[PDB]
Amino acid sequence: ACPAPPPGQPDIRAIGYYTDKAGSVIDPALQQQNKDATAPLDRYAADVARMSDDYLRNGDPAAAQCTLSWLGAWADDGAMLGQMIRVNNDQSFYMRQWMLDAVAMAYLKVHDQANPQQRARIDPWLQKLARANLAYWDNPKRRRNNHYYWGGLGVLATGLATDDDALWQAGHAAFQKGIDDIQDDGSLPLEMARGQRALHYHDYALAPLVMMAELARLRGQDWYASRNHAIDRLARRVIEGSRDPAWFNQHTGAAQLPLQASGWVEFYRLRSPDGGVFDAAHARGPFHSPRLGGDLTLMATHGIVRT
8 A cells, every 4th residue: 555665766867957146047958957856856756745634634554654764765865965967056855855854744744653763764864954054055155045945944853853952053043043044124235136036036025934933833832923923024036026026127127927925825814814915826825845844725724733
């Protein structure tokens, strides 16, 4: 009933696909090469997300056990613990952040079913991935843009799932850095440099921030409140941008690619009475994002965890 897991590869090879300084104009040939190079990793991310979604849907212990079996197998293989292979950028380092976010969120959703021996194989594997991801940010030259926030999500989730306070603190640090980047106009300077994809990259930066706030909520802490609800300024900047890109068009000088808001709207619409602001975006779901933890529609309604 539980299909055999695919083999875990120690190395990641991934390829950058922007042609311009502002990381906004895509080279189709490099994009497809990146897709083909990362297809095993994205298939595994999608599979553990879906199987962990099915556990939350009906409580089926088979779904949880299959998720834990796939996680255990990649742990045993030292998956993603080898070389981060560079072709034209650090796209491999980014894949290890996104993959940690998927696998650590999948593990958190099924953790309540995990026996002491599954915990002993999976916990140390997630913890080394988290430290590898933190170590990347030790170089002051790498600017702490949306990648930093996507990085914090996986480190925080590992922290929570494996009871590692050092990883929780480093996760919180990343959240707080992102909240403090939010300007009075609700913009993020490092995302404003991204041209026709500026609006896209505000949506992309907000998502891991929302999901770190949801993880805090599991421990009974309200991080939405930080800096008198500063996160609301970014949520407004994004949701109004999806309705009308004019403000972004004026501040970037580039015509924006039209944005449909990602599934952070599913959690956000429930944290305050929204007076209809997220009605249109909600109607575009359900939202499946393995790197945010899978079925955000399901998790916003029923909880990231069952207990």
